[PDB]
Amino acid sequence: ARAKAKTRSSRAGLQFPVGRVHRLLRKGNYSERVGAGAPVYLAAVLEYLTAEILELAGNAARDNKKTRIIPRHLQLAIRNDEELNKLLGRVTIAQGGVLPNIQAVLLPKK
Amino acid sequence: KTRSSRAGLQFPVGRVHRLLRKGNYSERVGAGAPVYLAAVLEYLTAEILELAGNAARDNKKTRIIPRHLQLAIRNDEELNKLLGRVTIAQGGVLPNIQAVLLP
Amino acid sequence: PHRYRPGTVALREIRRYQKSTELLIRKLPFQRLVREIAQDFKTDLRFQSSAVMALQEACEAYLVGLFEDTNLCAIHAKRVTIMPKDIQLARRIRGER
Amino acid sequence: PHRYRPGTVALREIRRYQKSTELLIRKLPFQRLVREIAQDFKTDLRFQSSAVMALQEACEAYLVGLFEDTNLCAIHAKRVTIMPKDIQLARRIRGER
Amino acid sequence: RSLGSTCHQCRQKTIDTKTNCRNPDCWGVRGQFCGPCLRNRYGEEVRDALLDPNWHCPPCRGICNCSFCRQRDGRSATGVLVYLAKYHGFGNVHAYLKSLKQE
Amino acid sequence: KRSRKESYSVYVYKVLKQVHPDTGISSKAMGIMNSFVNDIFERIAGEASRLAHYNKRSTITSREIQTAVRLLLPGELAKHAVSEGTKAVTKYTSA
Amino acid sequence: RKESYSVYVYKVLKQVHPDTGISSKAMGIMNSFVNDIFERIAGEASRLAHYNKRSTITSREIQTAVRLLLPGELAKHAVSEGTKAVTKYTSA
Amino acid sequence: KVLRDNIQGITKPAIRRLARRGGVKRISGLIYEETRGVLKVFLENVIRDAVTYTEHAKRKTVTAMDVVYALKRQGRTLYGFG
Amino acid sequence: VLRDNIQGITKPAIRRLARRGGVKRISGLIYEETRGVLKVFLENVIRDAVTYTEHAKRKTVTAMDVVYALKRQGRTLYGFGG
DNA sequence: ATCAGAATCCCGGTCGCGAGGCCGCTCAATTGGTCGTAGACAGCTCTAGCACCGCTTAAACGCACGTACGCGCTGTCCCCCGCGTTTTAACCGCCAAGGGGATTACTCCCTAGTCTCCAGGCACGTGTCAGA
DNA sequence: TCTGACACGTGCCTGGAGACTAGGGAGTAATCCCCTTGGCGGTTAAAACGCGGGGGACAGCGCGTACGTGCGTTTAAGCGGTGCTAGAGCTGTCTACGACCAATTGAGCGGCCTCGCGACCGGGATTCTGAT
Ligand SMILES: [Zn+2]
Ligand SMILES: [Zn+2]
Ligand SMILES: [Zn+2]
Questions:
Q1: Which residues carry this modification: N6-lactoyllysine (chains C, D)?
Q2: Domain that holds residue I32
Q3: How many domains does chain H have?
């Protein structure tokens, strides 16, 4: 009867595409064959990391009372979380600026 | 009749082709790709070996040990830059003392 | 006349430019520099606007990070002004020869 | 009796140990430390001898490089002795902090 | 961001009652105006506009001076004109605008 | 005559509506999260390929993905990310 | 069983130094160096093959990878020592 | 078409602004030439790699992706233009 | 069980490592800082070595696992089968 | 410490370009079946970690002593910062060409792929010689 | 003198080489348009100079802390044996799993268009320093 097709991401309960990730793995010449539980794991991991960065960036924008994330709200969302900072420690972000940080030695005396 | 003889190299070419195919770098590997790769590997190894042998000769020694290799890499600028983040077992370090340290 | 004590506008500028995000080098001089440098390697080259913008963004990020390291080296030596020796020490420790 | 001025034996061992190439930490204490550290990751592990030897070589190389950078930091601040702040500065600039 | 109505003249999001266009031929949201804009532009209020059965949106009568509609007429942007009308004794800019055309 | 190219903007946006229902994202920031996804994907896939090659295996499986996530991601992330992926995989088992 | 670059590096050493031998530990170090450089160049050539939408690794990919990794005089030399082999293969 | 003496276009106020973003408060008068040299070296490396990629692509134009790959090869991954 | 073995990295051993590094005078508080630094580095390498070993369902940490763990951190080590 | 220049939010007016959605295709993900082999499980074997025991005996370790050098204090020039003036090239909005990145249509020849055979490295086994 | 680590000798497979093939990757012509290259005029903001002077770099000095050097005591690292067994390698069987392949159908990409957000100014607090 060939019941109505459902995307493998739906079976995995995801939002990132498991099928596209499978195709990218197979065509990206990483190994001769790839399993059925590799794309699911990788897509879930990418979805989770994106979810955390978006969680932090939305708050970073809200404290700036803005209703549209810009690159700045990513940098403030990245260099403030120690683990996310460690994961992306060798990455530059275009139009991201930098955290405000003045050394205590330079601050005015008295 | 081996592939190295046709290209005139002492490094393998068939083995390099097998390692290119079995290492899934690409779906297809061209004819001259293993030849070029083997020639470049042979050149780099020859340069390293020449420098290490000169260092051993200046050391009054017959066999090349890791110390000689470390000296050869750490003295040649280009080879040092190519191997800037590599540690050599029992390779030691270049003897150097800062000027202010001296009496 | 009102005259700020030396160093006040330095902290004011520090706050103002650490708050912002725009590029600090003017676009035309950097475009000229990029073209001048790239003309050596290949001739009659062409650059996408995105290429020049990406190069400028990378250069500003690198220089800002280097200046943070230089400032740390300056503060280490019981100083407030960054000198060339601080830049040299930061570049030597970072491994940038 | 004969007594070397302070710092003479310092340079003597400096030259002696940059001339040499062997491991400078005792084998048994380092092996015990490696086993104790690895005890917290997987219970009842076993180590090939070459594994512990490789760990010792890597650790000694790392510490020697760190001490080189620390000496550079100490010289920058117009000093001869190395203090913890120099190690901290070297590790911060290297990206380890 | 998903609840507030947007005025046609000011084109911002705010929580306020806005008038409606009763023209059967009227289409879109362009029949909605906020009090601060219409009271400053034409001297009309929210209450009277709501209560009038034959009240039409300023675009319906052709007296809309919104920048979008002003550009659709092929003529420039008004900007801020309230104080200019006040200095000239005009209660609303529409009378000021009509007087400007007459002059 | 289209040059249509794939991009995760359909998902990067759609997962943003599940975590911040009333917050947008600029097209200059969509092209940054796109690169973040395309970078982490490559990192984990390359590590999985290396792990598969070390053990003389030819099949990349969820064990290599799990070990790669454990190797790259630091701290609680590696403790949390894995707990996500496993769930998905086990859900996939139930179909 | 296990394979290595021992025979080939020994041949190269005898060519460049007729009267110099090599130690087993240093021989393993040379094996590791050859493997590392081969991995680096092959991976970079794979990356260029992927970037330009090409399914074949050719001499051009290896040449450009050599130009990308090897610094300064090491690059221009190695390229000249690489193509010289390939053209020889053309002559057969 | 040719150009000459453009590294002086990296002005003293621009370098001072870049230092201000870096958090420095006082600037020695000798760091401007140092920063110009450092920037020139960094640009030389990245542009050389980018033009190498462009040449391998058989293209007469340099695109953003060539620059991004050139930066990634130096461990300076850039987000926003890829 | 094993404990306090970090004290087994004796003060003269740290002295020898520093002398090989090229330092001539050492402050008295350097030793504890060096012990902490070495412990952190050792933990970082050993974690990945044990991860590599566990991925292969082995109870023995081979030299090649340590080589891979060191390579992961950009500290490639030659001469141990790499 | 209080008052006044000076810089800066702040909250009313507008406006303007981009960002959410929305509709139409089209390209690729999904379904299903078949088939080959890659990895899993079970025995067997030999290796090589691991635990102990003694025994030297270099290396670590406490204390003593002296002095090198880190560190706080003064001076003292002097170099960089802040501000006013002038001037000059970046920026913005236009037009104007055309060079080349991009995309089809061949079509040709380069390279997996199979089979067969064979000689180049590998391991076991000594033997002269570096050199510790 | 003696230590053995390294130099070959020789079976021996077992990976590499030679012929032949067919199919798909990739040069090549043949546009096409788009998005890089220029001129060109204002103009305004932003770089460049000049000048006063104040805070900071840099050298000097002195006292005291803390480290290097040496010596006698101790103690466990290192070496050499000796069993013992956990477990790493290796092989054999065969089964579950992933690749390859023909429909086919919907998810996502391009264009569109309008709605809401993120900007500009323009007067009034609101801090923010500086000197008294
Ligand atoms: Zn309104
Ligand atoms: Zn209406
Ligand atoms: Zn209107």
A1: 19, 42
A2: 1-80
A3: 1
> Which among G92, G68, G90, G88 is positioned nearest to G78, based on CA atoms?
G68
Residue I64's contacts (CB-CB under 8 Å, 6 or more residues apart) are F54, I80, I81, I82
DSSP H or E segment with residue H77: strand H77-79
Window 72-101 of A: residues touching F by CB (8 A cutoff) are 73-74, 82-84, 86-88, 91, 93-95
Question: What is the count of structural domains for chain A?
Answer: 1
CATH number of H68's domain = 1.10.20.10
B85 touches chain A (CB under 8 A): no
Output the domain CATH number for residue C4.
Answer: 1.10.20.10
- Residue whose CA is minimally distant from J5 C1': C2
Q: Half-sphere exposure of C44 toward its Cβ, with a 13 Å CA cutoff?
A: 2
> C49: domain range?
1-97
Is residue F33 one of the residues assigned to a domain?
yes
To the nearest 10°, report the CA torsion of H59, H75, G79, G11. -150
Domain of residue B59 covers: 1-103
* G1 assigned to some structural domain: no
Domain CATH for A53: 1.10.20.10
| DSSP per-residue letters across chain B | --HHHHHT-SS-SHHHHHHHHHTTS-SEE-SHHHHHHHHHHHHHHHHHHHHHHHHHHHTT-SEE-HHHHHHHHHHSHHHHHHTTTEEETT--------GGG--
Record the tokens describing residue E78, joined without a space: 């008004």
Alpha helical stretches, state H, chain I: 11-21, 30-55, 63-72
The coordinates were experimentally obtained by cryo-EM
Residues 6+ apart with CB under 8 A from C9: none
At G14, which CATH number?
1.10.20.10
Resolution of this model in Å is 3.0
Instruction: Report the distance separating Cα D2 and Cα F48, nearest Å.
Output: 64
Domain total of chain F = 1
